[PDB]
Design a protein around this ligand. Sequence first.
Ligand SMILES: Cc1ccccc1Oc1cc(-n2c(=O)cc(S(=O)(=O)c3ccccc3)[nH]c2=O)c(F)cc1C#N
Ligand SMILES: Cc1ccccc1Oc1cc(-n2c(=O)cc(S(=O)(=O)c3ccccc3)[nH]c2=O)c(F)cc1C#N
Ligand SMILES: *Cc1c(COP(=O)(O)O)cnc(C)c1O
Ligand SMILES: *Cc1c(COP(=O)(O)O)cnc(C)c1O
Ligand SMILES: [Mg+2]
Lengths: 363, 361
Amino acid sequence: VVGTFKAKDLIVTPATILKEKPDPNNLVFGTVFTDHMLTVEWSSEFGWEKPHIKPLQNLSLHPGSSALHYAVELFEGLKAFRGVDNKIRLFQPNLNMDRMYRSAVRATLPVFDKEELLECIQQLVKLDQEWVPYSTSASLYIRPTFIGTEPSLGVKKPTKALLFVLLSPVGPYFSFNPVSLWANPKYVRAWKGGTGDCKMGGNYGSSLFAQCEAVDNGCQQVLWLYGEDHQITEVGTMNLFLYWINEDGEEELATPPLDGIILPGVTRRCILDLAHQWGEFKVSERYLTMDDLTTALEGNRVREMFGSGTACVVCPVSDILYKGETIHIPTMENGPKLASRILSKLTDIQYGREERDWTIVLS
Amino acid sequence: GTFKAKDLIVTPATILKEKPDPNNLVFGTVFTDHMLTVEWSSEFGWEKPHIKPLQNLSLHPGSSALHYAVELFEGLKAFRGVDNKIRLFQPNLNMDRMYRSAVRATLPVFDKEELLECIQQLVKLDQEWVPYSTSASLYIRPTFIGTEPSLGVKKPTKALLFVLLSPVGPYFSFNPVSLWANPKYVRAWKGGTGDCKMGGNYGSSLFAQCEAVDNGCQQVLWLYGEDHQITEVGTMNLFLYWINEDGEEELATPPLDGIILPGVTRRCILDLAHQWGEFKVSERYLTMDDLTTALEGNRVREMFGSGTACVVCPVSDILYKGETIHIPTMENGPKLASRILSKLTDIQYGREERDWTIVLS
Ligand SMILES: Cc1ccccc1Oc1cc(-n2c(=O)cc(S(=O)(=O)c3ccccc3)[nH]c2=O)c(F)cc1C#N
Ligand SMILES: Cc1ccccc1Oc1cc(-n2c(=O)cc(S(=O)(=O)c3ccccc3)[nH]c2=O)c(F)cc1C#N
Ligand SMILES: *Cc1c(COP(=O)(O)O)cnc(C)c1O
Ligand SMILES: *Cc1c(COP(=O)(O)O)cnc(C)c1O
Ligand SMILES: [Mg+2]
């Protein structure tokens, strides 16, 4: 009956005892949580309950919950930034609401009003705003999560769900400290006709084995390969950019196209928009193979390779382990000039050093 | 290391729930009085196993089962025999598959015989839930989740293994199924986890299943590749009983090349077909074009799905490219489907002795 929850209906239960904030420079990504969380219950019978901001607490879930059996779940990732003017800003948060709604439809989780969820998120951040670090290299990570909670082993559209939001203060990185990539084509992240273009939990559970194999070989991320010609698709959890002289001898920033096996990153979209705006080199959404890359390296045609994502912004790549060899990528010996310029521009926008359509000041 | 059944801590319920009518059972909606839980940490390993009253789980909202689908499950049944002895059916094959699923999920390994003994003790305590009916059974749902309170993408350092029991009727609610065949959706890929019972394989498949039901179909016919290989009957393995291209009587099923879940029911059916030695048994690729060419030549006898929940699930129709393609399964007996169902149910309910059953602990 209640088609969507409304921020105007928020019930706020503040915590009695507030926790000590961590040192911004000693932060391990996603291990520290703020005082409060957002929860909103849904049922097929009654629709959306009123949204709650309350102290961070365990979830009480029926052990038959479809999130635990059939990965009926999705998540988002976005950040709050304390500006040089001390105003807290979100970055492109409507793109995260759009993507979460699209993910929910694909997961068969109940739809919600995107503007009402964003307002509830703003009110949660506002309450916990002293967690948004006083540092131009740290931020508050925002993790909207949406799970099936129906107490039934049936394989079907859930009749019960929980939408919740966690906040986690994070440093500039995770622990330019460049990443080594593990490339093993025996493992495939995502396929045409699959859900790799949605942020659904199921995409990541199936990717964990390759990630643990990467870390066992001293690599931080998996280079995700696709098809008989070994297309390079994603830098682990991040979109893939290659800055090089292409086959026609033109300076080019290249990234794989949104053909269904690529997560359409907010950071990816912003980087393409900046590169188009600058007009200093060719910008191509195009297929890239291991053979394209190794042929280019042998011709000294590669300048830079980096991943893009909310957590890293720009993540330079120095090495790829492939067929038993270490292939060096000369990113850090080429500046990295473009990676640095992109990171400078995005952080200038995020921390309010310049005005942008891409940021909103916290309500 | 492993938890040990000899260490079981049993907390019996003081208030029992009313048992349901065996003839009114909706699959997986009714749960018994007790559950099994076992905690693991990287720091200290496996804690002692607990049998205690069914309860909600208390999970940190950062638990990797909720964000990154760090989870797997199993499905097997307990049967009250015609002699009133409760039997499990091929449960060691479920333990083998659950162990393999755990390794692929990066969840901690455990001793398969210790888990089976703990499952036997749980069923024994809740044995009056095993229905008094030769067409009902007790569904057993071992489940294994990552519970580490961290958004890190990494091997979990905290996990919970639990087992739920659910009495179930005949079927879900021979009532043959109609299949929805749309090649725009792909269940599983080579280099993926489709050959393991990991939660992630199923969350991504729900959209197609809801589209199937909207078109009056009970299951999705999972198609793969440019040639539209027929792979799985929704949640079930796919069998085709036909005259093949060489004019030989043949039972065909897709091979285990990485996109097929290796079913216990599938294994039992191949074992029986090989034992009978009355026709060719082939693990081979089957395409929509193979099927339609065969139907036009009146070469198809039967198509059925196999799984713990259905045993043998006859297929009457496939909706494909806007046509209903009739499969003549129910006009051909279905003789093989019936023979298989008769044999497996005879073994499950102790109407004949078999190496495939264990009488309860
Ligand atoms: C109500 C009804 C009437 C007639 C035929 C089917 C019916 O319901 C369905 C049940 C299932 N279904 C489950 O609900 C659970 C399992 S399971 O728990 O045994 C299992 C889960 C995951 C993988 C393998 C088995 N396996 C299943 O097939 C399904 F997938 C689709 C439908 C539909 N429509
Ligand atoms: C410890 C360390 C040292 C140096 C570089 C990275 C390091 O940590 C890692 C972080 C991540 N990692 C996360 O843990 C979470 C997200 S996330 O929450 O932003 C995210 C998760 C899922 C999809 C998209 C983003 N994104 C990530 O890359 C990872 F996958 C692998 C490693 C490794 N090794
Ligand atoms: C989340 C994600 C990205 C990057 O998305 P952003 O919106 O830039 O944070 C890239 N690839 C994969 C696989 C992802 O899950
Ligand atoms: C579980 C499962 C089967 C059949 O497994 P059984 O062990 O026979 O119950 C078939 N296909 C898929 C996709 C499955 O998940
Ligand atoms: Mg509105």
